[PDB]
PDB file of C-alpha atoms and ligand atoms in Angstrom:
ATOM      1  CA  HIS A   4       7.427  12.466 -18.807  1.00 36.94           C
ATOM      2  CA  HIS A   5       9.877  11.413 -15.979  1.00 34.61           C
ATOM      3  CA  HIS A   6      11.696  14.559 -14.586  1.00 34.65           C
ATOM      4  CA  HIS A   7      14.852  14.121 -12.633  1.00 32.89           C
ATOM      5  CA  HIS A   8      16.987  16.759 -10.813  1.00 34.04           C
ATOM      6  CA  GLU A  14      19.100  11.562  -3.161  1.00 32.19           C
ATOM      7  CA  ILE A  15      16.569   8.940  -2.501  1.00 29.60           C
ATOM      8  CA  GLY A  16      18.161   5.906  -0.946  1.00 28.07           C
ATOM      9  CA  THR A  17      18.077   2.495  -2.792  1.00 29.98           C
ATOM     10  CA  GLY A  18      19.508   0.244  -0.121  1.00 28.40           C
ATOM     11  CA  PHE A  19      17.329  -1.768   2.365  1.00 29.10           C
ATOM     12  CA  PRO A  20      19.425  -1.647   5.602  1.00 27.54           C
ATOM     13  CA  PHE A  21      16.963  -3.801   7.745  1.00 26.78           C
ATOM     14  CA  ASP A  22      17.726  -7.212   9.294  1.00 28.97           C
ATOM     15  CA  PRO A  23      15.177  -9.901   8.217  1.00 32.56           C
ATOM     16  CA  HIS A  24      12.604 -10.946  10.651  1.00 30.96           C
ATOM     17  CA  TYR A  25      10.313 -13.980   9.993  1.00 31.74           C
ATOM     18  CA  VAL A  26       7.094 -15.159  11.722  1.00 27.97           C
ATOM     19  CA  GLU A  27       5.019 -18.388  11.199  1.00 29.60           C
ATOM     20  CA  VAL A  28       1.516 -17.231  10.409  1.00 34.00           C
ATOM     21  CA  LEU A  29      -1.151 -19.832   9.151  1.00 33.20           C
ATOM     22  CA  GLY A  30       1.622 -22.414   8.198  1.00 30.76           C
ATOM     23  CA  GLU A  31       3.595 -19.866   6.318  1.00 34.38           C
ATOM     24  CA  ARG A  32       6.503 -17.589   6.959  1.00 33.57           C
ATOM     25  CA  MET A  33       5.976 -13.930   6.578  1.00 29.26           C
ATOM     26  CA  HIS A  34       9.026 -11.552   6.523  1.00 33.22           C
ATOM     27  CA  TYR A  35       8.846  -8.081   8.119  1.00 30.79           C
ATOM     28  CA  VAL A  36      10.936  -5.127   9.110  1.00 29.36           C
ATOM     29  CA  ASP A  37      11.094  -4.638  12.963  1.00 27.89           C
ATOM     30  CA  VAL A  38      13.309  -1.676  14.141  1.00 25.70           C
ATOM     31  CA  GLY A  39      13.261   1.135  16.797  1.00 24.58           C
ATOM     32  CA  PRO A  40      12.359   0.558  20.452  1.00 21.83           C
ATOM     33  CA  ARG A  41      11.437  -3.062  21.349  1.00 20.68           C
ATOM     34  CA  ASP A  42       8.256  -2.158  23.090  1.00 18.02           C
ATOM     35  CA  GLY A  43       5.539   0.534  23.228  1.00 17.69           C
ATOM     36  CA  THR A  44       3.062   1.546  20.516  1.00 15.44           C
ATOM     37  CA  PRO A  45       4.311   0.447  17.207  1.00 15.88           C
ATOM     38  CA  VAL A  46       3.952   2.201  13.797  1.00 16.87           C
ATOM     39  CA  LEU A  47       2.608  -0.391  11.494  1.00 18.14           C
ATOM     40  CA  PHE A  48       3.507   0.257   7.751  1.00 20.12           C
ATOM     41  CA  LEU A  49       1.424  -1.642   5.175  1.00 17.96           C
ATOM     42  CA  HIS A  50       2.428  -1.545   1.446  1.00 18.57           C
ATOM     43  CA  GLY A  51       0.045  -2.323  -1.288  1.00 19.75           C
ATOM     44  CA  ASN A  52       0.677  -3.353  -5.038  1.00 21.42           C
ATOM     45  CA  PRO A  53       3.137  -4.276  -6.548  1.00 21.14           C
ATOM     46  CA  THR A  54       5.486  -3.497  -3.739  1.00 21.87           C
ATOM     47  CA  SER A  55       6.748  -4.780  -0.385  1.00 23.68           C
ATOM     48  CA  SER A  56       8.356  -3.257   2.845  1.00 27.22           C
ATOM     49  CA  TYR A  57      10.983  -1.866   0.387  1.00 29.80           C
ATOM     50  CA  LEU A  58       8.442   0.964  -0.176  1.00 31.08           C
ATOM     51  CA  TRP A  59       8.949   2.291   3.139  1.00 32.51           C
ATOM     52  CA  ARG A  60      12.643   2.052   3.187  1.00 32.88           C
ATOM     53  CA  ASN A  61      13.264   5.823   3.181  1.00 30.63           C
ATOM     54  CA  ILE A  62      10.236   6.651   5.462  1.00 33.06           C
ATOM     55  CA  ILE A  63      11.025   4.121   8.375  1.00 29.03           C
ATOM     56  CA  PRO A  64      14.264   5.973   9.543  1.00 27.72           C
ATOM     57  CA  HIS A  65      12.235   9.110  10.327  1.00 26.28           C
ATOM     58  CA  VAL A  66      10.073   7.226  12.703  1.00 22.83           C
ATOM     59  CA  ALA A  67      12.385   4.662  14.197  1.00 23.89           C
ATOM     60  CA  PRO A  68      14.238   6.932  16.495  1.00 23.45           C
ATOM     61  CA  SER A  69      10.976   7.345  18.439  1.00 23.93           C
ATOM     62  CA  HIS A  70       8.762   4.331  17.823  1.00 24.10           C
ATOM     63  CA  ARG A  71       8.988   0.591  17.084  1.00 25.80           C
ATOM     64  CA  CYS A  72       8.547   0.190  13.342  1.00 25.57           C
ATOM     65  CA  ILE A  73       7.000  -2.913  11.878  1.00 27.91           C
ATOM     66  CA  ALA A  74       6.514  -3.456   8.162  1.00 25.51           C
ATOM     67  CA  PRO A  75       5.291  -6.858   6.862  1.00 26.06           C
ATOM     68  CA  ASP A  76       5.670  -8.163   3.477  1.00 25.20           C
ATOM     69  CA  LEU A  77       2.092  -9.120   2.413  1.00 20.67           C
ATOM     70  CA  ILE A  78       1.598 -12.989   1.813  1.00 20.61           C
ATOM     71  CA  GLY A  79       2.902 -13.953  -1.607  1.00 21.44           C
ATOM     72  CA  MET A  80       4.930 -10.642  -1.806  1.00 22.18           C
ATOM     73  CA  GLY A  81       8.273  -9.342  -0.830  1.00 22.50           C
ATOM     74  CA  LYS A  82      10.129 -11.981   1.016  1.00 23.03           C
ATOM     75  CA  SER A  83       7.049 -13.666   2.438  1.00 24.19           C
ATOM     76  CA  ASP A  84       6.160 -17.199   1.602  1.00 26.54           C
ATOM     77  CA  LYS A  85       4.272 -18.062  -1.609  1.00 28.12           C
ATOM     78  CA  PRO A  86       1.412 -20.381  -0.694  1.00 28.90           C
ATOM     79  CA  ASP A  87      -0.959 -21.509  -3.570  1.00 26.86           C
ATOM     80  CA  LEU A  88      -3.763 -19.236  -2.999  1.00 24.76           C
ATOM     81  CA  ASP A  89      -6.099 -17.061  -5.262  1.00 24.79           C
ATOM     82  CA  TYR A  90      -4.795 -14.100  -3.437  1.00 25.91           C
ATOM     83  CA  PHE A  91      -8.043 -12.059  -3.188  1.00 28.95           C
ATOM     84  CA  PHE A  92      -8.341  -9.425  -0.745  1.00 30.64           C
ATOM     85  CA  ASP A  93      -9.860 -11.798   1.625  1.00 30.23           C
ATOM     86  CA  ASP A  94      -6.694 -13.812   1.591  1.00 25.39           C
ATOM     87  CA  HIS A  95      -4.582 -10.852   2.444  1.00 28.26           C
ATOM     88  CA  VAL A  96      -7.075  -9.941   5.271  1.00 29.07           C
ATOM     89  CA  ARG A  97      -6.683 -13.529   6.839  1.00 26.78           C
ATOM     90  CA  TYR A  98      -2.957 -13.497   6.694  1.00 28.80           C
ATOM     91  CA  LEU A  99      -2.545  -9.965   7.974  1.00 29.47           C
ATOM     92  CA  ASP A 100      -4.892 -10.454  10.804  1.00 26.86           C
ATOM     93  CA  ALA A 101      -2.906 -13.320  11.931  1.00 25.53           C
ATOM     94  CA  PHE A 102       0.310 -11.541  11.521  1.00 28.77           C
ATOM     95  CA  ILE A 103      -0.704  -8.851  13.858  1.00 25.48           C
ATOM     96  CA  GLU A 104      -1.991 -11.337  16.423  1.00 23.66           C
ATOM     97  CA  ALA A 105       1.267 -13.491  15.953  1.00 22.92           C
ATOM     98  CA  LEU A 106       3.265 -10.471  17.092  1.00 22.01           C
ATOM     99  CA  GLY A 107       0.935  -9.870  20.000  1.00 23.73           C
ATOM    100  CA  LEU A 108       0.169  -6.145  18.879  1.00 21.66           C
ATOM    101  CA  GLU A 109      -2.273  -4.168  20.810  1.00 21.81           C
ATOM    102  CA  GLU A 110      -2.617  -0.472  20.055  1.00 21.38           C
ATOM    103  CA  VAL A 111      -0.927   0.690  16.792  1.00 21.69           C
ATOM    104  CA  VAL A 112      -0.509   3.590  14.529  1.00 22.95           C
ATOM    105  CA  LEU A 113      -1.141   2.710  10.886  1.00 24.33           C
ATOM    106  CA  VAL A 114       0.826   3.942   7.927  1.00 23.42           C
ATOM    107  CA  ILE A 115      -0.842   2.690   4.783  1.00 22.42           C
ATOM    108  CA  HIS A 116      -1.013   2.840   1.034  1.00 24.98           C
ATOM    109  CA  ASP A 117      -3.138   1.226  -1.898  1.00 25.88           C
ATOM    110  CA  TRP A 118      -4.110  -2.401  -0.849  1.00 26.62           C
ATOM    111  CA  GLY A 119      -2.291  -1.791   2.323  1.00 23.45           C
ATOM    112  CA  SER A 120      -4.818   1.088   3.010  1.00 23.46           C
ATOM    113  CA  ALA A 121      -7.816  -1.210   2.296  1.00 19.33           C
ATOM    114  CA  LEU A 122      -6.254  -3.747   4.688  1.00 20.08           C
ATOM    115  CA  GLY A 123      -5.479  -0.988   7.217  1.00 19.24           C
ATOM    116  CA  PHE A 124      -8.883   0.872   6.998  1.00 19.11           C
ATOM    117  CA  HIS A 125     -10.677  -2.690   7.183  1.00 20.44           C
ATOM    118  CA  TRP A 126      -8.648  -3.688  10.216  1.00 22.73           C
ATOM    119  CA  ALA A 127      -9.220  -0.324  11.996  1.00 21.53           C
ATOM    120  CA  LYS A 128     -13.106  -0.458  11.395  1.00 22.15           C
ATOM    121  CA  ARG A 129     -13.052  -3.904  13.091  1.00 20.54           C
ATOM    122  CA  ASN A 130     -10.623  -2.933  15.732  1.00 23.10           C
ATOM    123  CA  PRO A 131     -11.377   0.741  16.436  1.00 26.68           C
ATOM    124  CA  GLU A 132     -10.084   0.699  20.026  1.00 25.29           C
ATOM    125  CA  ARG A 133      -6.576  -0.348  18.835  1.00 30.86           C
ATOM    126  CA  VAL A 134      -5.799   2.333  16.348  1.00 34.70           C
ATOM    127  CA  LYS A 135      -4.353   5.727  17.779  1.00 34.43           C
ATOM    128  CA  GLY A 136      -3.837   7.222  14.354  1.00 33.37           C
ATOM    129  CA  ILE A 137      -3.937   6.697  10.633  1.00 30.28           C
ATOM    130  CA  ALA A 138      -1.375   8.071   8.155  1.00 33.60           C
ATOM    131  CA  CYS A 139      -2.508   7.307   4.518  1.00 34.27           C
ATOM    132  CA  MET A 140      -1.730   8.174   0.832  1.00 35.19           C
ATOM    133  CA  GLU A 141      -3.160   7.099  -2.592  1.00 34.53           C
ATOM    134  CA  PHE A 142      -5.690   4.929  -0.754  1.00 35.59           C
ATOM    135  CA  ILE A 143      -8.527   2.829  -2.136  1.00 34.87           C
ATOM    136  CA  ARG A 144     -12.039   4.240  -2.384  1.00 31.66           C
ATOM    137  CA  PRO A 145     -14.900   3.119  -4.820  1.00 32.54           C
ATOM    138  CA  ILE A 146     -14.573   4.454  -8.323  1.00 29.68           C
ATOM    139  CA  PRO A 147     -18.088   4.803  -9.680  1.00 29.69           C
ATOM    140  CA  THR A 148     -17.128   4.600 -13.411  1.00 32.18           C
ATOM    141  CA  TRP A 149     -14.242   4.258 -15.817  1.00 31.81           C
ATOM    142  CA  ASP A 150     -14.861   7.887 -16.817  1.00 31.51           C
ATOM    143  CA  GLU A 151     -13.197   8.942 -13.504  1.00 30.25           C
ATOM    144  CA  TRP A 152     -10.177   6.594 -13.998  1.00 31.67           C
ATOM    145  CA  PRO A 153      -7.306   8.757 -15.433  1.00 33.50           C
ATOM    146  CA  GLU A 154      -7.142   8.374 -19.375  1.00 37.44           C
ATOM    147  CA  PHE A 155      -3.242   7.660 -19.280  1.00 38.39           C
ATOM    148  CA  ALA A 156      -3.770   4.200 -17.593  1.00 40.38           C
ATOM    149  CA  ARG A 157      -7.353   3.503 -18.633  1.00 40.60           C
ATOM    150  CA  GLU A 158      -6.960   1.120 -21.469  1.00 42.57           C
ATOM    151  CA  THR A 159      -3.957  -0.517 -19.596  1.00 43.42           C
ATOM    152  CA  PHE A 160      -6.161  -1.354 -16.417  1.00 41.72           C
ATOM    153  CA  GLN A 161      -9.227  -2.341 -18.430  1.00 38.55           C
ATOM    154  CA  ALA A 162      -6.926  -4.818 -20.187  1.00 37.42           C
ATOM    155  CA  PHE A 163      -5.545  -5.996 -16.675  1.00 35.49           C
ATOM    156  CA  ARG A 164      -9.123  -6.486 -15.621  1.00 37.31           C
ATOM    157  CA  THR A 165      -9.760  -9.534 -17.899  1.00 35.81           C
ATOM    158  CA  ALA A 166      -8.874 -13.337 -17.381  1.00 36.44           C
ATOM    159  CA  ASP A 167      -7.319 -13.699 -20.905  1.00 38.99           C
ATOM    160  CA  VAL A 168      -5.583 -10.466 -22.004  1.00 39.21           C
ATOM    161  CA  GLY A 169      -5.073  -9.500 -18.403  1.00 38.57           C
ATOM    162  CA  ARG A 170      -3.190 -12.611 -17.347  1.00 39.81           C
ATOM    163  CA  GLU A 171      -1.127 -12.531 -20.488  1.00 38.31           C
ATOM    164  CA  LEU A 172      -0.017  -8.986 -19.612  1.00 39.33           C
ATOM    165  CA  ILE A 173       0.513  -9.346 -15.916  1.00 42.83           C
ATOM    166  CA  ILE A 174       1.579 -12.950 -15.513  1.00 38.99           C
ATOM    167  CA  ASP A 175       3.201 -13.865 -18.916  1.00 35.70           C
ATOM    168  CA  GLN A 176       4.732 -10.407 -19.671  1.00 33.62           C
ATOM    169  CA  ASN A 177       5.052  -9.005 -16.065  1.00 34.28           C
ATOM    170  CA  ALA A 178       3.603  -5.845 -17.352  1.00 32.90           C
ATOM    171  CA  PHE A 179       2.630  -4.796 -13.760  1.00 35.69           C
ATOM    172  CA  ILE A 180       6.212  -4.649 -12.612  1.00 35.39           C
ATOM    173  CA  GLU A 181       7.832  -3.487 -16.037  1.00 34.97           C
ATOM    174  CA  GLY A 182       5.064  -1.103 -16.979  1.00 32.63           C
ATOM    175  CA  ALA A 183       2.710  -0.022 -14.340  1.00 32.12           C
ATOM    176  CA  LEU A 184       5.273   0.287 -11.515  1.00 28.18           C
ATOM    177  CA  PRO A 185       7.750   2.888 -13.088  1.00 28.98           C
ATOM    178  CA  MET A 186       4.672   4.632 -14.486  1.00 31.10           C
ATOM    179  CA  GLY A 187       3.426   5.336 -10.947  1.00 31.70           C
ATOM    180  CA  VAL A 188       6.557   7.468  -9.888  1.00 31.32           C
ATOM    181  CA  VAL A 189       7.178  10.856 -11.296  1.00 26.52           C
ATOM    182  CA  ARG A 190      10.913  10.592 -11.004  1.00 27.40           C
ATOM    183  CA  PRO A 191      12.587   7.704 -12.748  1.00 30.35           C
ATOM    184  CA  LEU A 192      13.078   4.643 -10.800  1.00 30.48           C
ATOM    185  CA  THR A 193      16.628   3.285 -10.968  1.00 29.98           C
ATOM    186  CA  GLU A 194      17.663  -0.244 -12.133  1.00 29.52           C
ATOM    187  CA  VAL A 195      18.571  -0.918  -8.479  1.00 26.37           C
ATOM    188  CA  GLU A 196      15.216   0.026  -7.215  1.00 21.54           C
ATOM    189  CA  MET A 197      13.347  -1.822  -9.919  1.00 22.34           C
ATOM    190  CA  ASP A 198      15.555  -5.010  -9.255  1.00 20.29           C
ATOM    191  CA  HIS A 199      14.462  -4.801  -5.575  1.00 19.32           C
ATOM    192  CA  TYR A 200      10.866  -4.776  -6.783  1.00 21.51           C
ATOM    193  CA  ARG A 201      11.419  -7.384  -9.378  1.00 21.49           C
ATOM    194  CA  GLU A 202      12.838  -9.808  -7.082  1.00 21.55           C
ATOM    195  CA  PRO A 203       9.705 -11.635  -5.573  1.00 20.18           C
ATOM    196  CA  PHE A 204       8.205 -12.016  -9.173  1.00 21.72           C
ATOM    197  CA  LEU A 205      11.126 -13.447 -11.314  1.00 22.54           C
ATOM    198  CA  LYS A 206       8.950 -16.492 -12.094  1.00 27.40           C
ATOM    199  CA  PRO A 207       5.674 -16.112 -13.931  1.00 27.20           C
ATOM    200  CA  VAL A 208       3.962 -18.623 -11.714  1.00 23.40           C
ATOM    201  CA  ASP A 209       4.591 -16.276  -8.689  1.00 25.66           C
ATOM    202  CA  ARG A 210       2.652 -13.431 -10.243  1.00 23.80           C
ATOM    203  CA  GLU A 211      -0.866 -14.444  -9.265  1.00 24.54           C
ATOM    204  CA  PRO A 212      -0.981 -11.771  -6.466  1.00 25.92           C
ATOM    205  CA  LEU A 213      -0.239  -9.067  -9.162  1.00 26.19           C
ATOM    206  CA  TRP A 214      -3.187 -10.097 -11.361  1.00 24.08           C
ATOM    207  CA  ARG A 215      -5.653 -10.614  -8.692  1.00 24.66           C
ATOM    208  CA  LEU A 216      -5.256  -7.162  -6.999  1.00 22.39           C
ATOM    209  CA  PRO A 217      -6.055  -4.897 -10.002  1.00 22.28           C
ATOM    210  CA  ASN A 218      -9.126  -7.331 -10.518  1.00 23.37           C
ATOM    211  CA  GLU A 219     -10.106  -6.571  -6.910  1.00 19.25           C
ATOM    212  CA  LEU A 220     -10.233  -2.798  -7.332  1.00 18.28           C
ATOM    213  CA  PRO A 221     -13.786  -1.411  -6.801  1.00 17.26           C
ATOM    214  CA  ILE A 222     -14.471   0.077 -10.096  1.00 19.60           C
ATOM    215  CA  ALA A 223     -18.024   0.575 -11.609  1.00 22.06           C
ATOM    216  CA  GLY A 224     -19.519  -1.666  -8.871  1.00 20.17           C
ATOM    217  CA  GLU A 225     -17.386  -4.581  -9.325  1.00 21.69           C
ATOM    218  CA  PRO A 226     -16.424  -6.883  -7.665  1.00 19.38           C
ATOM    219  CA  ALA A 227     -19.498  -6.260  -5.456  1.00 25.92           C
ATOM    220  CA  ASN A 228     -17.985  -7.677  -2.335  1.00 22.26           C
ATOM    221  CA  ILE A 229     -15.002  -5.346  -2.376  1.00 21.49           C
ATOM    222  CA  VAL A 230     -17.218  -2.334  -3.333  1.00 20.52           C
ATOM    223  CA  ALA A 231     -19.214  -2.992  -0.220  1.00 24.91           C
ATOM    224  CA  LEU A 232     -16.366  -3.504   2.021  1.00 26.44           C
ATOM    225  CA  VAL A 233     -14.679  -0.407   0.960  1.00 23.58           C
ATOM    226  CA  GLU A 234     -17.928   1.490   1.231  1.00 21.88           C
ATOM    227  CA  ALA A 235     -18.085   0.248   4.738  1.00 18.44           C
ATOM    228  CA  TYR A 236     -14.643   1.446   5.835  1.00 19.89           C
ATOM    229  CA  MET A 237     -15.189   4.678   4.083  1.00 19.59           C
ATOM    230  CA  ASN A 238     -18.360   5.087   6.174  1.00 20.64           C
ATOM    231  CA  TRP A 239     -16.402   4.168   9.325  1.00 21.64           C
ATOM    232  CA  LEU A 240     -13.664   6.824   8.268  1.00 22.29           C
ATOM    233  CA  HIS A 241     -16.225   9.635   7.955  1.00 24.76           C
ATOM    234  CA  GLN A 242     -17.522   9.327  11.344  1.00 26.39           C
ATOM    235  CA  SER A 243     -14.285   8.349  13.224  1.00 26.97           C
ATOM    236  CA  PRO A 244     -12.518  10.843  15.384  1.00 25.72           C
ATOM    237  CA  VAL A 245      -9.215   9.013  14.860  1.00 22.95           C
ATOM    238  CA  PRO A 246      -6.229  11.239  14.054  1.00 20.79           C
ATOM    239  CA  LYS A 247      -5.797  11.085  10.274  1.00 21.83           C
ATOM    240  CA  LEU A 248      -2.707  12.263   8.254  1.00 21.65           C
ATOM    241  CA  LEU A 249      -3.285  12.362   4.472  1.00 17.64           C
ATOM    242  CA  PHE A 250      -0.338  12.706   2.038  1.00 18.27           C
ATOM    243  CA  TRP A 251      -1.285  13.641  -1.522  1.00 19.45           C
ATOM    244  CA  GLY A 252       0.524  14.588  -4.717  1.00 20.70           C
ATOM    245  CA  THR A 253      -0.294  16.498  -7.944  1.00 22.15           C
ATOM    246  CA  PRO A 254      -1.739  15.157 -10.182  1.00 23.30           C
ATOM    247  CA  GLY A 255      -1.863  12.068  -7.904  1.00 22.35           C
ATOM    248  CA  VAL A 256      -3.771   9.064  -9.286  1.00 21.94           C
ATOM    249  CA  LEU A 257      -6.277   7.408  -6.669  1.00 24.31           C
ATOM    250  CA  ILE A 258      -6.506  10.664  -4.673  1.00 22.36           C
ATOM    251  CA  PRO A 259      -6.256  13.767  -6.753  1.00 22.31           C
ATOM    252  CA  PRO A 260      -5.799  17.318  -5.200  1.00 22.85           C
ATOM    253  CA  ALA A 261      -9.534  18.019  -5.472  1.00 22.95           C
ATOM    254  CA  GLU A 262     -10.392  14.719  -3.575  1.00 24.78           C
ATOM    255  CA  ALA A 263      -7.779  15.419  -0.919  1.00 28.42           C
ATOM    256  CA  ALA A 264      -9.399  18.850  -0.274  1.00 26.84           C
ATOM    257  CA  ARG A 265     -12.812  17.300  -0.049  1.00 26.95           C
ATOM    258  CA  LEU A 266     -11.479  14.620   2.518  1.00 29.61           C
ATOM    259  CA  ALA A 267      -9.740  17.530   4.486  1.00 30.34           C
ATOM    260  CA  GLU A 268     -13.304  18.632   5.304  1.00 29.13           C
ATOM    261  CA  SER A 269     -15.226  15.469   5.306  1.00 30.86           C
ATOM    262  CA  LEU A 270     -12.888  13.403   7.381  1.00 31.61           C
ATOM    263  CA  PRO A 271     -12.796  14.301  11.200  1.00 31.77           C
ATOM    264  CA  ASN A 272      -9.578  15.172  12.639  1.00 29.58           C
ATOM    265  CA  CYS A 273      -7.709  15.152   9.407  1.00 29.65           C
ATOM    266  CA  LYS A 274      -4.476  16.845   8.487  1.00 29.48           C
ATOM    267  CA  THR A 275      -3.279  17.027   4.763  1.00 29.35           C
ATOM    268  CA  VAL A 276       0.169  17.287   3.416  1.00 27.50           C
ATOM    269  CA  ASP A 277       1.073  18.379  -0.224  1.00 26.71           C
ATOM    270  CA  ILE A 278       4.133  16.479  -1.257  1.00 29.12           C
ATOM    271  CA  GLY A 279       4.346  18.061  -4.655  1.00 32.31           C
ATOM    272  CA  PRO A 280       4.762  16.190  -7.960  1.00 33.29           C
ATOM    273  CA  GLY A 281       3.275  12.706  -7.474  1.00 33.08           C
ATOM    274  CA  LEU A 282       1.324   9.959  -9.024  1.00 33.90           C
ATOM    275  CA  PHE A 283       0.779   6.746  -7.250  1.00 35.72           C
ATOM    276  CA  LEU A 284       3.940   5.675  -5.329  1.00 36.56           C
ATOM    277  CA  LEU A 285       4.187   9.049  -3.461  1.00 39.65           C
ATOM    278  CA  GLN A 286       6.981   7.342  -1.186  1.00 37.46           C
ATOM    279  CA  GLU A 287       9.236   7.258  -4.197  1.00 37.12           C
ATOM    280  CA  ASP A 288       8.938  10.853  -5.173  1.00 37.00           C
ATOM    281  CA  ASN A 289       9.091  12.676  -1.532  1.00 35.01           C
ATOM    282  CA  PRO A 290      10.009  10.260   1.123  1.00 33.96           C
ATOM    283  CA  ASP A 291      11.676  12.840   3.115  1.00 32.70           C
ATOM    284  CA  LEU A 292       8.620  14.943   3.548  1.00 29.94           C
ATOM    285  CA  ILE A 293       6.509  11.945   4.150  1.00 31.76           C
ATOM    286  CA  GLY A 294       8.816  10.624   6.900  1.00 33.27           C
ATOM    287  CA  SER A 295       9.458  13.974   8.429  1.00 34.52           C
ATOM    288  CA  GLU A 296       5.794  14.913   8.662  1.00 35.97           C
ATOM    289  CA  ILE A 297       4.873  11.586  10.146  1.00 37.90           C
ATOM    290  CA  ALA A 298       7.511  12.060  12.798  1.00 36.05           C
ATOM    291  CA  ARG A 299       6.139  15.518  13.504  1.00 35.59           C
ATOM    292  CA  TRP A 300       2.420  14.158  13.863  1.00 36.46           C
ATOM    293  CA  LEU A 301       3.328  11.256  16.324  1.00 37.08           C
ATOM    294  CA  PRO A 302       4.033  13.140  19.541  1.00 34.83           C
ATOM    295  CA  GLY A 303       0.559  14.642  19.308  1.00 35.15           C
ATOM    296  CA  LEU A 304      -1.095  11.180  19.252  1.00 35.97           C
ATOM    297  CA  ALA A 305      -0.122   9.957  22.928  1.00 33.04           C
ATOM    298  CA  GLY A 306       1.570  10.758  26.209  1.00 33.12           C
TER     299      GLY A 306
HETATM  300  C1  LIG B 401      -3.582   4.652 -12.857  1.00 36.05           C
HETATM  301  C2  LIG B 401      -3.390   3.397 -12.047  1.00 36.05           C
HETATM  302  O1  LIG B 401      -2.852   3.656 -10.833  1.00 36.05           O
HETATM  303  C3  LIG B 401      -1.734   2.842 -10.575  1.00 36.05           C
HETATM  304  C4  LIG B 401      -0.512   3.129 -11.192  1.00 36.05           C
HETATM  305  C5  LIG B 401      -0.134   4.612 -12.305  1.00 36.05           C
HETATM  306  C6  LIG B 401       0.705   2.427 -11.040  1.00 36.05           C
HETATM  307  C7  LIG B 401       0.430   1.309 -10.274  1.00 36.05           C
HETATM  308  C8  LIG B 401       1.775   0.291  -9.870  1.00 36.05           C
HETATM  309  C9  LIG B 401      -0.776   1.003  -9.577  1.00 36.05           C
HETATM  310  C10 LIG B 401      -1.889   1.784  -9.819  1.00 36.05           C
HETATM  311  C11 LIG B 401      -3.258   1.416  -9.290  1.00 36.05           C
HETATM  312  N1  LIG B 401      -3.047   0.526  -8.030  1.00 36.05           N
HETATM  313  C12 LIG B 401      -3.492  -0.675  -7.915  1.00 36.05           C
HETATM  314  N2  LIG B 401      -3.750  -1.407  -9.059  1.00 36.05           N
HETATM  315  N3  LIG B 401      -4.043  -2.672  -8.591  1.00 36.05           N
HETATM  316  N4  LIG B 401      -3.887  -2.712  -7.194  1.00 36.05           N
HETATM  317  N5  LIG B 401      -3.468  -1.570  -6.706  1.00 36.05           N
HETATM  318 NA1  LIG B 402      -0.957  -5.708  -9.028  1.00 36.91          NA
HETATM  319 NA1  LIG B 403      14.022  10.411   3.922  1.00 38.93          NA
END
């Protein structure tokens, strides 16, 4: 299933920390020290590590900022329920703590829900959005791909799901490498495993799949996601959408629809890809973001 043949495994970024709502959040901060930054938002079950091979394409021209979401990566681990709303609160405060004004967003998965939700609420501060495998409402399980349907239905329970994700670390050991076409190496996996070595620290990994808007639940997330999707369809903000085949959250047919239904939207085919497109073709993702940036300002 996993086909293979140079994707870098190192993380050559100095750590930065900022105090946000009584907690330390870790972030990458490279490139120019001022000017419009490009803000990279990872989703589940990743961290700023997800962007390690994309950032170097952008850092020559723009400040690059990539936070680790609260409870993830190298950020602190407060005793939260880690609902989407918790991530909204911490990211909002992170952005303000850095004094960011106008930004360009580069977003994925739950980072895309964060990014789109933030953009909706702050539309005057978003110069452009690059996105890939983003969250939109999923009307029924019929539309969720069969290869991962029984798995994600099991994840979305309080007994079986917590046993799988918290006790057996199945989201890291199972779902993560399943979301990449090529085989992730032990080194890359160990980077991803690092924040979750202890079962008690896996709460964020269980709550996030339980927050996905599937079959109308949870209703608050469904409504929130519908709201930012409605915003996106009427917004003239420049959009760059990366998609793979067969993809997972954004299949080729959905990408094609969005190419027409989203204003000012350019799409890029990265080739083979499932969920973590950044791990299959970071070169093209990085280079195309870089090609797109000059057209946004100046
Ligand atoms: C087929 C399922 O797609 C996924 C796959 C194949 C792998 C992963 C790591 C994640 C997802 C889904 N994204 C996600 N789950 N909970 N929060 N965000
Ligand atoms: Na998760
Ligand atoms: Na690259």
